[PDB]
Ligand binder design. Structure first.
Ligand SMILES: *[C@@H]1O[C@H](CO)[C@@H](O[C@@H]2O[C@H](CO)[C@@H](O[C@@H]3O[C@H](CO[C@H]4O[C@H](CO[C@H]5O[C@H](CO)[C@@H](O)[C@H](O)[C@@H]5O)[C@@H](O)[C@H](O[C@H]5O[C@H](CO)[C@@H](O)[C@H](O)[C@@H]5O[C@H]5O[C@H](CO)[C@@H](O)[C@H](O)[C@@H]5O)[C@@H]4O)[C@@H](O)[C@H](O[C@H]4O[C@H](CO)[C@@H](O)[C@H](O)[C@@H]4O[C@H]4O[C@H](CO)[C@@H](O)[C@H](O)[C@@H]4O)[C@@H]3O)[C@H](O)[C@H]2NC(C)=O)[C@H](O)[C@H]1NC(C)=O
Ligand SMILES: CC(=O)N1CCC(c2ccc3ncn(CC(=O)N(C)Cc4ccc(Cl)c(OC(F)(F)F)c4)c(=O)c3c2)CC1
Ligand SMILES: [Ca+2]
Ligand SMILES: [Cl-]
Ligand SMILES: [K+]
Ligand code: NA
Ligand SMILES: [Zn+2]
Length: 804
């Protein structure tokens, strides 16, 4: 597009409103667009005399050619060097002052609300906070006086643009559209790349970023984007100048961005000796901002967020897996390479391209293979990485410390020159990044548990008094970060009330093709259990609330309670408690193939055994495990047709090991557990519960729908000295969402005993309770003694199984 660079930046330097059409620009992005007016450098990027006052410059006569000023008039003009008051007025640097609690905002007249400054640092690995602490005195003061987490979990892929735009929107990359640092949209036949102009087009960038949310609601916003060649000292000086604008013109939200330490980390590795200097330099920049805020009397008024996008791992050229070592047809594909792989067909006009044969040729081919292929819908649900046409059907998850590439010549175009990289699974320790919150709205000297970057947008909205756009955070889950909370969450209303059926059908009314070998005062006890006498033991936190319109029944039993769906012909949820002392037993010989009609539920709303006999692929399992029955008589309950769910034989290997061995291990380790298990249907891989008309597979000849996944939520007392069923304080939870697959190809060791691979699979598919809520339309923990904000934090917890 033609620019008339003929105009001037006089009185326009770093203007807030971006200009067109062929007119030249003076804003902080004009350099990226190559559209700055001819005099932008002269007027706007002054450098004379550097960035610091010195004794002899004090009270100088103003010289407008200087980078910053030491003249008497500078504070009124808003353009002193950040160390002016220290050098010329005997003041102390902010870092040398004692921490003092900020109980209330202390702001100059005309400030309507405390401003928010986001200070984002690329590649700032979480352990830098401890490991680089001797050389970062300013950052360490923010961290220990403010609110901080030991680390913050980024989104997958742990690349720069997906994570910065998640910070800004509160959305998963599948929903905001920025799904990697490089992308091809098939409906655009356009690529998006780090370097280039295509990324400037707004069509890639979905959702509603914080600056738009603010502007729509009458809060003014600084530019979050920075051109790479504007130096850091000039970015800081520009933010401080904007903060001296008149009340009607002054933004309330600002962002600073640093390319370091990422830039050096790629060259030298995360802990190369060359990394000390980039850390010192970011600390100095923090020092400049805080000294400048202190001059303008805003150091006890502004809220500051020091936040990273992802970490950095050791990665070298010789740790590259090559697709040419696996596939013959290597030139029929296009690969997006590196710390993750995405594979598509080279040519739309190629009809002999087979994803199925590509996966098979990539599956368990070499003993210590350093990647694993997945159809995108089979990736761990915790990654939320599938519901976007820019994400290719075929995906490779790459081991930490490794790369994937198509052919050797792609790498050794042969010397190396890179020692660090990122992009791996977001549960990986080296990928974690940082959060510090400092200012009047944050708590004083407070440590909070680790949390996910998707939650920050809601909190930044609360900090500015904005109503957040719809997003993937759970609003209220981070209230514990804040001294004054704008947001008080309330529980969603239950939409469907359950039926409580009694005995309504005679045995001979059922014609389900099922058989079971199952033919005083003990009689009253049986009825009590069926009516809910033990329900307080097995349903510890209330029944889950059904948040959509449906028909379902509550079923009580000695050992477990369930919510049984008349529409899906199976439980939506099944809840049971296993104490530390519980005994495991076997399924007796005469009960191996036992399935029993449930006389509370009509034949018309039941599964049938004939369908499973006819369907040669599909078998069945049970939600409450018969192995954990409390007595030989209660065990008959576990064989009810209302406790049955469809399972592939290959999946029953996983499920039976979980129910027979692991549940008991967890009860032993945690001093009792309460378990809620159920089916999930997500045939369109959008992370959301399917309606019945979205189901793509049924048990042959029937209306019994086949789940895509099975979940379990496992709860106990955070103080493990108290048993799960008598717990007075906070709770502890782990959960999973296992894919319901007809093979165990995902597990390369699946020919061995389950003791060698099953728990490993489960750990990979760890989940948050909130992930399960989205996928089921249920709302858990409705009746506890805990506060709702606390329950929201619990529902967002992810058990990661990483070491320390
Ligand atoms: C994480 O959080 C997010 C955010 O809350 C959740 O994602 C939301 O989920 C909703 C349900 O799936 C979905 O609702 C859809 O949306 C349809 C309209 O969508 C467009 O308009 C949106 C609103 O924009 C305005 O407001 C926002 C403020 O937030 C501003 O930013 C805007 O400027 C507007 O003022 C807009 O956000 C949305 O953005 C997507 O599409 C853009 C352009 O393509 C992209 O740039 C952007 O990145 C978004 O892309 C994502 O989302 C799309 C799906 O929308 C997806 O394909 C991509 O892969 C990507 O993931 C749009 O521009 C609306 O028409 C839908 O209604 C239809 O379906 C239902 C039944 O299913 C009916 O109720 C309805 O009558 C209608 O049926 C008809 O259409 C059917 C399908 O076409 C058809 O088959 C049928 O026959 C009928 O004719 C529905 O409401 C939201 O759009 C979505 N939002 C976002 C931002 O992603 C997400 O679910 C959460 N994740 C988890 C795991 O919880
Ligand atoms: C969508 C839109 O309005 N567009 C589309 C994109 C356009 C555009 C035009 C020129 C550009 N020049 C340089 N850079 C690099 C940069 O600014 N980085 C790495 C910092 C950064 C990037 C993202 C977020 Cl979210 C962020 O904020 C933060 F840090 F807070 F997350 C901070 C750009 O990204 C860039 C983008 C502007 C208009
Ligand atoms: Ca779905
Ligand atoms: Cl990428
Ligand atoms: K079968
Ligand atoms: Na296998
Ligand atoms: Zn990087």
């Amino acid at each position: 597009p033609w620019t008339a660079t003929s105009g001037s930046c006089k009185g326009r330097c770093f203007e807030l409103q971006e200009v067109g059409p062929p007119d030249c620009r003076c804003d902080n992005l004009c350099k990226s667009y190559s559209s700055c007016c001819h005099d932008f450098d002269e007027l706007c990027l002054k450098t004379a005399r550097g960035w610091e006052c010195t004794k002899d410059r004090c009270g100088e006569v103003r010289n407008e050619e200087n980078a910053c000023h030491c003249s008497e008039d500078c504070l009124s003009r808003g353009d002193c060097c950040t160390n002016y008051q220290v050098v010329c007025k005997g003041e102390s640097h902010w870092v040398d002052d004692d921490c003092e609690e900020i109980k209330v905002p202390e702001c100059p007249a005309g400030f309507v609300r405390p401003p928010l400054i986001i200070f984002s640092v690329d590649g700032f690995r979480a352990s830098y906070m401890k490991k680089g602490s001797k050389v970062m005195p300013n950052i360490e003061k923010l961290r220990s006086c403010g609110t901080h987490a030991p680390y913050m979990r980024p989104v997958y892929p742990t690349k720069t643009f997906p994570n910065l735009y998640t910070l800004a929107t509160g959305l998963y990359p599948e929903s905001h559209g920025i799904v990697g640092n490089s992308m091809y949209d098939p409906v655009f036949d356009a690529s998006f790349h780090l370097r280039g102009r295509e990324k400037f087009n707004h069509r890639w960038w979905g959702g509603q970023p914080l600056w738009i949310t603010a502007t729509k609601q009458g809060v003014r916003a600084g530019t979050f984007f920075w051109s790479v060649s504007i130096p850091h000292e000039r970015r800081i000086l520009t933010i401080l100048q904007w903060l001296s604008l008149p009340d009607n013109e002054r933004p309330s939200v600002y962002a600073f961005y640093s390319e370091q330490p990422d830039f050096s980390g790629h060259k030298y590795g995360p802990f190369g000796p060359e990394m000390t200097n980039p850390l010192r330099e970011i600390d100095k920049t923090v020092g400049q901002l805080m000294d400048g805020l202190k001059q303008l009397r805003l150091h006890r008024c502004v809220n500051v967020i020091f936040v990273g996008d992802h970490g950095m791992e050791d990665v070298t050229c010789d740790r590259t897996e090559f697709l040419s070592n696996y596939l013959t047809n290597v030139d029929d594909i296009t690969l997006v390479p590196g710390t993750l792989g995405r594979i598509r067909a080279k040519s739309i006009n190629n009809s002999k391209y087979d994803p199925k044969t590509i996966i098979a040729a990539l599956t368990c081919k070499k003993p210590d293979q350093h990647f694993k292929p997945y159809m995108k819908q089979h990736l761990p649900k915790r990654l939320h990485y599938a519901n976007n046409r820019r994400i290719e059907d075929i995906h490779l998850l790459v081991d930490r410390r490794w790369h994937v590439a198509r052919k050797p010549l792609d790498v050794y175009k042969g010397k190396c020159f890179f020692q660090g990289d990122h992009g791996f699974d977001n549960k990986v320790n080296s990928m974690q990044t940082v959060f510090v919150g400092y200012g009047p709205t944050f708590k004083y000297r407070t440590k909070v548990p680790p949390f996910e970057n998707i939650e920050l947008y809601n909190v930044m909205c609360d900090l500015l008094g904005l109503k957040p756009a719809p997003n993937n955070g759970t609003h209220g889950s981070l209230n514990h970060l804040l001294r004054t909370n704008t947001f008080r969450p309330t529980m969603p209303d239950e939409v469907s009330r359950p039926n409580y059926p009694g005995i309504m059908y005679l045995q001979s009314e059922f014609d389900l093709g099922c058989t079971c070998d199952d033919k005083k005062l003990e009689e009253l006890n049986k009825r009590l259990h069926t009516k809910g006498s033990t329900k307080e033991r097995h349903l510890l936190y209330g029944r889950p609330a059904v948040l959509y319109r449906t028909s379902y029944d509550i079923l009580y039993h000695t050992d477990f309670e369930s919510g049984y769906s008349e529409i899906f012909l199976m439980p939506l949820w099944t809840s049971y408690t296993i104490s530390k002392q519980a005994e495991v037993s076997s399924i007796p010989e005469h009960l191996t193939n036992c399935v029993r009609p449930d006389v509370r539920v009509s034949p018309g709303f039941s599964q049938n055994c004939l369908a499973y006999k006819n369907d040669k692929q599909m078998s069945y399992g049970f939600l409450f495990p018969p192995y954990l029955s409390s007595s030989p008589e209660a065990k008959y309950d576990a064989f009810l047709v209302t406790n049955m769910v469809p399972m592939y034989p290959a999946f029953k290997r996983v499920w039976a090991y979980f129910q027979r061995v692991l549940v008991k291990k967890y009860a032993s380790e945690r001093n009792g557990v309460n378990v809620i298990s159920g089916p999930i249907f997500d045939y369109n891989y959008d992370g959301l519960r399917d309606t019945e008309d979205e189901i793509k597979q049924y048990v042959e000849g029937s209306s019994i729908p086949v789940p895509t996944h099975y979940y379990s939520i496992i709860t106990s007392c955070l103080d493990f000295t108290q048993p799960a069923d008598k717990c007075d304080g906070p709770l502890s939870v782990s959960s999973f969402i296992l894919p319901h697959r007809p093979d165990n190809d995902e597990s390369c060791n699946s020919s061995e005993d389950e003791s060698k691979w099953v728990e490993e699979l489960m750990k990979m598919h760890t989940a948050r309770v909130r992930d399960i809520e989205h996928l089921t339309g249920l709302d858990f923990y409705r009746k506890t003694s805990r506060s709702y904000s606390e329950i929201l934090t619990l529902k967002t917890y992810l058990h990661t199984y990483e070491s320390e």
